[PDB]
């Protein structure tokens, strides 16, 4: 079974210049790429066959090209909606196989966080657990590490966070926080940190709460 | 997205082994090749050899084949070369670097952090400065000029301080160089002529192995 | 062993230019070729493989191309932040070979080299032996030949010098001069001269010292 | 042996122009060409080899292309300093064998020759020989055709002329007049006659002179 | 980085031989095959042979084959070709360049300095200018031109003075011609009609070679 593998996995540009995605398959076909364009919540569309021809509705924009195996897409000059996830298939040897997806995103400028850090209340006790949230807002780009310290340790499994897609106008994420532990264990330690370290500053900031509080 | 982490630069008289290692992430580790490229002076580089890291492959340069073994830890991730009976001109730079899946072609995406590796029996030893002052008596031209010098060393290297850090715009640095199994350092500074008879410069060198900081007065 | 030639060896250009580097290898390989970048004190880090696809992160300002034997790599056009070797590679056959490498330095008008001569002191004649010193400074281009007269004669073994690499501001190079002779052969002459060799004149300039000056 | 033919043998262009030469070849190499510029009393440098590639330290306004037997080698756009001779190589079969050569000159308008005789003087009698000149001086093109008319009749052997190269600032030529004649035929006719048909006039002028003139 | 040096130009008798040398550097003298081309009158190139400099290879061209060998000193550098039975048409500035490594193809890239050698059984002769001056006693038009004449000259060549060096503007220069085995020289100067009568020039023609200066009152 032929299998596919696209280049980058995630590529950020703004609008205006011109993106070459790849695609590579392990045997030669010479005779089938299929290039696609799925907005989020959407169908998949067809944009390129054949590796050059594109298809009707498709606006001039996109230029495909490539022989043998190594192929490419060429896009110029980018547009506002043309913004999604690609993928690349196979008409050759039965499975058709698809690409693993390339993300296309708007490319911004550098912005901070928003550090949010809440205790737990009173009324999730009655069910026989807590739960303690941290959230973060308005931050680019998408890379982050959580970090969680109690009593100077990381605590595993069950920290795992969920994030937003791109914004419109705005065009950022959003993190969220569940923790799922009990009421007994809760009272067990005091200090309690949410850590995030991200490349607008070389020392996350702290921010930290208490019992009594 | 993939880091290539490698260890610290070491150092061993001729005749003994060394091991280095090679950590990765980022990618499945048992799916993708590495191999090891060494690079002399100046610029030259060789292929030393590759590795395929499912259960063991391997393949060795014809010159290479005997001074060197690829040996791989599948349960934690890294990459281990061993060298044996080592000499002076083996010492270089050795790098690490991913491969293509189930390929050894393909060329290297990903590099390390190129960790080098020195071979000499010479004994560290504290660092002595050298004066440089004028002169013959008349200075010319309207330039006056002067330096440092750094004797009996070892190993790399020193660092140059003018004035607790006054001036950094004139100062120049300059590599070792081989004499005697003994290496060697200089410097020049421009400076005008209205510093000396009147304004004093003085040189201080410190040595951050030995732990050795002598001040000259120029 | 396929063996790799590249022309030229060092190229001086300024910014702005187009820029053509050439590889070639001994026998035919047709489908492999890396050219790669390395700045000063850093990792290699791939620009072109398979002699005309450019890698990710690689600037659309690099075009590969070429067939057969003779390859080439094109630069148009040059930025400020491109300064730095490359590398050729095969993938064809074991060994996989690299060349010579070629320098790419900033392109720059003539200047006169900075003439220094100094005699040696009193400390060093404790320790048995005696070290003088010639400088030259701000000289452009490097190419220079060093030349000791000492009454009118040539000593070898034992003259050598080293240089520093280009400046960024500045961009110019610099020299030193390391002469190893013991303490009883240093009395033995008188006259000493530093002479170099440039373009800047047809004549070197010529300054010497004396033992009691 | 394969021989090689270059056309045109003069060709004249001024500065900014595009000028396309050729070469062939009686057999079809396929793999060789190499082009060379050797300025007046220099000598050859190569330009393009393989019939493609740009050899170093030649600018990019020099492209060859071609395949099979027929090459060529295209110049956009002039300069002032690449005037000169152009040849063509083979590196196929021994022997290696070159082209006739393809003169480039600068081109200018239309200029009228200086004409200029004069009669012999009474030095040279003494050693038994008599010989006058005629010299013209500021003309162009190059072509001409001399004529020397004594009584009606043309005279051969010994009627040969000389050329200056092409000048800088002026960029024009000269000639030069030298006849083998003895003393004793100098005095058995009278009318002589120097003749130039040149395309500035329909009717070449007429000078001429006498003995005791 | 390649500089190529040959011999000084040779002149000789018709049926001796001669031999020429051909020094470089910058390169290993052995990986690189070096070639030899001769330039006749005008512009006509031919290929004399190739050398491999490891122990000896040679090609020749069938039509040179005989009257030229190759022999090269591996120790100190050199290329040294030698010529048997000259003769008249055998007189052409010769060339010697590098090849390609390990080939002969892959046309030469550096040159040489293009050593002449000439060939002729004449003897040497002090030069004797000519006087040219006006005229038939009506001068036209504006513009009055004169020039120069020399005989009797051998082997090249001769140098031309106006005045000491008053103008070099319209003095021109011309080749010599070959007259019954000997050469000869010839001048224009364009100068418009307010010299003569009144401002008169002189001709001054010397000869390197033999150290002959004659100076003739035009």
């Known amino acids: 079974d032929i299998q596919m593998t696209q280049s980058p996995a995630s590529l950020s540009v703004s609008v205006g210049e011109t993106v070459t995605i790849t695609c590579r398959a392990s045997e030669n076909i010479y005779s089938n790429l299929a290039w696609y364009q799925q907005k989020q919540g959407k169908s998949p569309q067809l944009l390129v066959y054949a590796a050059t021809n594109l298809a009707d509705g498709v606006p001039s924009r996109f230029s495909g090209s490539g022989s043998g195996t190594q192929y490419s897409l060429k896009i110029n000059s980018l547009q506002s909606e043309d913004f999604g996830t690609?993928?690349?298939?196979?008409?050759?040897?039965?499975?058709?196989?698809?690409?693993?997806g390339t993300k296309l995103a708007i490319k911004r400028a550098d912005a901070a966080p928003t550090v949010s850090i809440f205790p737990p209340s009173s009324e999730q006790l009655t069910s026989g657990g807590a739960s303690v949230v941290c959230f973060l807002n308005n931050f680019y780009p998408k890379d982050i590490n959580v970090k969680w310290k109690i009593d100077g340790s990381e605590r595993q499994n069950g920290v795992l966070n969920s994030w937003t897609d791109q914004d419109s106008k705005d065009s950022t994420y959003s993190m969220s926080s569940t923790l799922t532990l009990t009421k007994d264990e809760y009272e067990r330690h005091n200090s309690y940190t949410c850590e995030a370290t991200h490349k607008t500053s070389t020392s996350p900031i702290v921010k930290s709460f208490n019992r009594n509080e | 997205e993939v880091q290539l982490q490698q260890s610290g630069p070491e150092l061993v008289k001729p005749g003994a082994s060394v091991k280095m290692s090679c950590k990765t992430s980022?990618?499945?580790?048992?799916?993708?090749?590495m191999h090891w490229v060494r690079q002399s002076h100046g610029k030259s580089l060789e292929w030393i050899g590759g590795?395929?890291?499912?259960?063991?492959?391997?393949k060795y340069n014809q010159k290479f084949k005997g001074k060197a073994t690829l040996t791989v830890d599948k349960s934690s991730s890294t990459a281990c070369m061993e060298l044996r009976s080592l000499t002076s001109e083996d010492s270089a730079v050795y790098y690490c670097?991913?491969?293509?899946?189930?390929?050894?072609?393909?060329?290297?995406?990903?590099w390390g952090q190129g960790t080098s590796v020195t071979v000499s029996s010479a004994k560290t030893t504290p660092p002595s400065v050298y004066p440089l002052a004028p002169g013959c008596g008349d200075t010319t031209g309207s330039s006056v000029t002067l330096g440092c010098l750094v004797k009996g060393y070892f190993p790399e290297s020193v660092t140059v301080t003018w004035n607790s850090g006054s001036l950094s715009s004139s100062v120049h640095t300059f590599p070792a160089l081989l004499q005697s199994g003994l290496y060697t350092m200089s410097s020049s500074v421009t400076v005008p002529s209205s510093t000396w008879p009147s304004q004093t410069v003085t040189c201080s060198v410190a040595h951050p192995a030995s732990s050795t900081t002598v001040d000259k007065k120029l | 062993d396929i063996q790799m030639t590249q022309s030229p060896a060092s190229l001086s250009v300024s910014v702005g230019e187009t820029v053509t580097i050439t590889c070639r290898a001994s026998e035919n390989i047709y489908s492999n070729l890396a050219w790669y970048q390395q700045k000063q004190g850093k990792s290699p880090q791939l620009l072109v493989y398979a002699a005309t696809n450019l890698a990710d992160g690689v600037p659309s300002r690099f075009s590969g191309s070429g067939s057969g034997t003779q390859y080439s790599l094109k630069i148009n056009s040059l930025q400020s932040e491109d300064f730095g070797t490359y590398y050729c590679?095969?993938?064809?056959?074991?060994?996989?070979?690299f060349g010579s490498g070629t320098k790419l330095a900033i392109k720059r008008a003539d200047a006169a080299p900075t003439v220094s001569i100094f005699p040696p002191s009193s400390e060093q004649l404790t320790s048995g032996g005696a070290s003088v010193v010639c400088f030259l400074n701000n000289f452009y281009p490097k190419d220079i030949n060093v030349k000791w007269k000492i009454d009118g004669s040539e000593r070898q073994n034992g003259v050598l010098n080293s240089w520093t690499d280009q400046d960024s501001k500045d961009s110019t190079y610099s020299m030193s001069s390391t002469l190893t002779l013991t303490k009883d052969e240093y009395e033995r002459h008188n006259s000493y001269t530093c002479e170099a060799t440039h373009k800047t004149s047809t004549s070197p300039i010529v300054k010497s010292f004396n033992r009691n000056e | 042996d394969i021989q090689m033919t270059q056309s045109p043998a003069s060709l004249s262009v001024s500065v900014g122009e595009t000028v396309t030469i050729t070469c062939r070849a009686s057999e079809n190499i396929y793999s060789n060409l190499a082009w060379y510029q050797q300025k007046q009393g220099k000598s050859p440098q190569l330009l393009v080899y393989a019939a493609t590639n740009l050899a170093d330290g030649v600018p990019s306004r020099f492209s060859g292309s071609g395949s099979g037997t027929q090459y060529s080698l295209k110049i956009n756009s002039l300069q002032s300093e690449d005037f000169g001779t152009?040849?063509?190589?083979?590196?196929?079969?021994?022997?290696?064998?070159?082209?006739?050569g393809t003169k480039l000159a600068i081109k200018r308008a239309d200029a009228a020759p200086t004409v200029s005789i004069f009669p012999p003087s009474s030095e040279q009698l003494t050693s038994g020989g008599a010989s006058v000149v005629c010299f013209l001086n500021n003309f162009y093109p190059k072509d001409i055709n001399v004529k020397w008319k004594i009584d009606g009749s043309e005279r051969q052997n010994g009627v040969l002329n000389s050329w200056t190269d092409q000048d800088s600032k002026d960029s024009t030529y000269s000639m030069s007049s030298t006849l083998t004649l003895t003393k004793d035929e100098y005095e058995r006719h009278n009318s002589y006659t120097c003749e130039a048909t040149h395309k500035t006039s329909t009717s070449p002028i007429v000078k001429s002179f006498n003995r005791n003139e | 980085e390649v500089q190529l040096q040959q011999s000084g130009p040779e002149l000789v008798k018709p049926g001796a031989s001669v031999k020429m040398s051909c020094?470089?550097?910058?390169?290993?003298?052995?990986?690189?095959?070096?070639?030899?081309v001769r330039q006749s009158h005008g512009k006509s190139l031919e290929w004399?042979?190739?050398?491999?400099?490891?122990?000896?290879?040679?090609?020749?061209?069938q039509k040179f084959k005989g009257k030229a060998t190759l022999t090269v000193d591996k120790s100190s550098s050199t290329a040294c070709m030698e010529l048997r039975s000259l003769t008249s048409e055998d007189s052409a500035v010769?060339?010697?360049?590098?090849?390609?490594?390990?080939?002969?193809?892959?046309?030469?890239?550096?040159?040489?300095?293009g050593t002449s050698v000439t060939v002729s059984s004449a003897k040497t002769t002090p030069p004797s200018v000519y006087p040219l001056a006006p005229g038939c006693g009506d001068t036209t038009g504006s513009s009055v031109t004169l020039g120069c004449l020399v005989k009797g000259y051998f082997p090249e060549s001769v140098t031309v003075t106006w005045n000491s060096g008053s103008l070099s503007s319209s003095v021109h220069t011309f080749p010599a011609l070959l007259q019954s085995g000997l050469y000869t020289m010839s001048s224009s100067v364009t100068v418009p009609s307010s010299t003569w009568p009144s401002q008169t020039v002189t001709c001054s023609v010397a000869h390197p070679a033999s150290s002959t200066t004659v100076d003739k009152k035009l």
């Open positions: 670097a991913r491969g293509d899946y189930e390929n050894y072609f393909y060329a290297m995406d990903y």
């Open positions: 590679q095969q993938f064809w056959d074991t060994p996989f070979t």
């Open positions: 980022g990618y499945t580790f048992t799916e993708n090749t």
């Open positions: 590795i395929y890291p499912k259960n063991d492959d391997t």
